[PDB]
Enzyme design. Structure first.
Site, PDB file in Angstrom:
ATOM      1  N   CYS A  66      27.099  33.517  -9.733  1.00 35.71           N
ATOM      2  CA  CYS A  66      27.053  32.534  -8.632  1.00 35.71           C
ATOM      3  C   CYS A  66      25.592  32.385  -8.225  1.00 35.71           C
ATOM      4  CB  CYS A  66      27.959  32.991  -7.498  1.00 35.71           C
ATOM      5  SG  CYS A  66      28.005  31.792  -6.152  1.00 35.71           S
ATOM      6  N   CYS A 117      25.049  31.931  -4.251  1.00 34.65           N
ATOM      7  CA  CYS A 117      25.470  33.023  -3.335  1.00 34.65           C
ATOM      8  C   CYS A 117      26.194  34.120  -4.118  1.00 34.65           C
ATOM      9  CB  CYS A 117      26.232  32.544  -2.114  1.00 34.65           C
ATOM     10  SG  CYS A 117      27.673  31.530  -2.509  1.00 34.65           S
ATOM     11  N   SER A 118      27.381  34.554  -3.764  1.00 35.90           N
ATOM     12  CA  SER A 118      27.948  35.836  -4.252  1.00 35.90           C
ATOM     13  C   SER A 118      29.408  35.625  -4.639  1.00 35.90           C
ATOM     14  CB  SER A 118      27.779  36.888  -3.183  1.00 35.90           C
ATOM     15  OG  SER A 118      28.365  36.416  -1.951  1.00 35.90           O
ATOM     16  N   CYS A 119      29.852  34.385  -4.837  1.00 35.56           N
ATOM     17  CA  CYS A 119      31.255  33.990  -5.189  1.00 35.56           C
ATOM     18  C   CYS A 119      31.756  34.803  -6.390  1.00 35.56           C
ATOM     19  CB  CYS A 119      31.347  32.524  -5.604  1.00 35.56           C
ATOM     20  SG  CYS A 119      31.042  31.336  -4.266  1.00 35.56           S
TER      21      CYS A 119
END
Lengths: 228, 203, 228, 203
Positions: B107, B110-112
């Site tokens: 991702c 971000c951190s998906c």
């Protein structure tokens, strides 16, 4: 926005730090930061897209080096101030109190069964972002499309590395909450969602891996047709 | 690594601890956060939801060609056959490693990450170092960081989860496992193998 | 390289810090850092392009928040280690010594008139980067050109915001030291230099200022013809 | 502004001071740096080279149309008529503000600036905040940071010094200055006016 969080393709961030093992939570504060998400979401501080937009507005040096769950704390405070649910002066006073008295108790409170039910229902049921819309999809598998060069200051999912690049539609997923509205407080305004394939030479230039591609998810307004 | 401007780890932890306890105290007084709500969320992601769930899905696909077809067709509906799904995996798309293709998921923004099959991501996945480099030099990153050599003739497909769609790699079944039980096969399936930064464990 | 130093178009870096006045040098260490440039340049640590490439390799969080002349110190040490002129272990030992004994003397040394003459000649004479080449310029005023999508890991002057964008050649300046060779230790290999005009809508998308343009300097290999 | 990870200004200055004194000691022992070389560089850029030199060039252009033509034709050769030039201004291109065009100069990739006419840049010029924003929203930046309103109908040209070419703005001569001496006109010419973030001072 064009913030530093948009790191795809950035050089010089250093070697990957990967300890041979690690706990899920490194400290009690991380567990609190994590559980605060369902709590502030249920209390209407923010939706998921707004949550991300809060982290995107951090001090970029703080963002790059701070513990992950610290980014979560920053977005809670951001949305707490934005909605008038958090008074910054009281938060600052309480911070100094717990600096000076780290073992002082938390406030007396009642347990609430409805918060446990909320947690269990979110975890096992999910918070699906899929929506029905009246319009059919503009695009289909195999369409050659160009990604927008728009550079909104507000929330979007427009990674700088894919802007103005040409790719092929791989999959139409149906319509979903649109981040460019939802993350800026303008509602779900759902849009059809596509996965688009970009070659590594398209992204990184004539020296790119000839046998690599990147698959990126594009809401309908992000892409326009080159060849059907 | 070195930043001459940065406080010690100890001083950073001390400051964050006070800031979080202060914010916690205010949300408690608002009636929206409780000690039982905190403990329940921690218990779910420490003990209940983790990559053992993804491993059950992979081994079922490895031993059941019809399930593997349903998994590649609609990952959310397929995982629900095993009672697997929920938060941050409402929309799962599984991608099949082959002799011709290697898949890796990131991702960048971000951190998906697909919580219902993998649990919470490891810190390296969420950090800028992996996110920045894997879309740009995946072949070199896999070799240098994970000791995983993907021959240059083999296509690498990097899946950047920019939406709520969650991509999960179905790794190839290692050689030497003919007729193994689902329990024995599950010992070869790692979080890393379903991210695509490693193959499934060799026998 | 695609480092964080390439900030043109980045959002979220915060308000400009502009005190109503400020000294040229805020501290004695800044004067030393500044004079170290002619000293290390004369001693062959680095040329100007290599000097910039050292700063581009800093820790990005350090780069974003550290005092400007600290970037200069980092590039001196970088090139000192690269050329084997600085032993890191000795530098670390001396650092601890001057931490513990900040008023301890500098080493005894002779003054050198040739270093003063070097300073005066550089300051008043300059270090011109203009060169003669055998090839005439490829491009001319009014040519419509596209900027390369190449993304070299080494030194270049290829700001992400102009990559793959279309502009008009405004001026041919003659040939100059080429950063893509000089900054990577591969020599001057001079190339013709052009100023290219890019509209704000070309750079930033359909919402950009319709009455703004950006003028960017392009070495010949950076640009190829669309329309003569 | 706030970074919870950042040391105090005092602690940062203490560490940098020790690091610089250590490096200084080694370059001294190598015979390549001396106390007299340090003092000479500081004296030149504290007392000798500064924006008073750029102001002499502007006022000559304001009072001499033929000099102004030579300045816009070849800035390096024109400034040399006044004994002005040298390090980091080997190649100067001057750009003329008009009722139709406003020029502003930046170095997005680093801190490039025309030392022989302006001296060393102010810290804000070198910092990421100005560099990032001026190519993207120059009209808003001039209004918000410098209180300088450029009407939307007027073109703003941003000059990003990516090369050794140095761009210098020739500001418009303020109204109310007919027949003023070069000395009186020079009081209106500021570093900011030759960067393009402010007009020359109004009478």
């Amino acid at each position: 926005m064009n913030g530093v969080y948009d790191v795809g393709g950035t050089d010089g961030l250093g070697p990957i730090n990967r300890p041979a093992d690690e706990p899920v939570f490194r400290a009690e504060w991380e567990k609190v930061a994590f559980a605060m998400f369902p709590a502030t979401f249920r209390a209407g501080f923010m939706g998921l897209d707004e949550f991300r937009f809060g982290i995107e507005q951090m001090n970029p040096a703080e963002y790059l080096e701070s513990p992950y769950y610290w980014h979560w704390i920053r977005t809670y405070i951001h949305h707490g101030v934005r909605t008038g649910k958090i008074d910054l002066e009281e938060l600052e006073r309480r911070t100094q109190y717990y600096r000076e008295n780290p073992d002082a108790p938390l406030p007396e409170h009642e347990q609430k069964p409805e918060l446990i039910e909320f947690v269990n229902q979110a975890v096992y049921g999910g918070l699906p972002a899929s929506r029905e819309v009246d319009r059919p999809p503009k695009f289909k598998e195999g369409d050659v499309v160009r990604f927008s060069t728009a550079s909104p200051k507000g929330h979007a999912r427009r990674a700088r590395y894919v802007r103005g690049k040409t790719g092929t539609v791989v999959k139409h997923h149906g319509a979903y909450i649109y981040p460019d509205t939802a993350g800026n407080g303008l509602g779900e305004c759902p849009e059809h969602l596509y996965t688009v394939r970009f070659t590594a030479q398209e992204l990184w230039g004539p020296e790119g891996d000839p046998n690599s591609s990147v698959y990126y998810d594009c809401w309908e307004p992000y892409i326009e047709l080159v060849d059907t | 690594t070195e930043n001459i401007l940065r406080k010690s780890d100890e001083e950073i932890q001390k400051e964050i601890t006070a800031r979080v306890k202060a914010l916690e105290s205010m949300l408690i007084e608002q009636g929206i956060l409780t000690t039982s709500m905190i403990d329940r969320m921690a218990e779910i992601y420490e003990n209940e939801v983790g990559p053992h769930l993804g491993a059950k899905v992979v081994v079922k696909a490895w031993t059941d060609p019809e399930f593997k077809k349903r998994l590649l067709a609609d990952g959310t509906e397929a995982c629900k056959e095993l009672g697997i799904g929920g938060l941050q995996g409402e929309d799962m798309m599984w991608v099949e490693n082959t002799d011709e293709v290697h898949h890796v998921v990131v991702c960048t923004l971000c951190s998906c990450y697909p919580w219902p099959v993998l649990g919470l991501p490891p810190n390296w996945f969420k950090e800028p170092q992996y996110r920045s480099r894997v879309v740009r030099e995946p072949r070199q990153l896999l070799k240098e960081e994970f000791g995983f050599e993907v021959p240059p003739s083999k296509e690498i497909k990097v899946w950047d989860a920019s939406s709520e769609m969650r991509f999960v790699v179905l790794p190839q079944r290692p050689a030497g496992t003919d007729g193994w039980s689902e329990e024995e096969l599950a010992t070869l399936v790692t979080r890393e193998s379903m991210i695509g930064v490693e193959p499934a464990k060799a026998v």
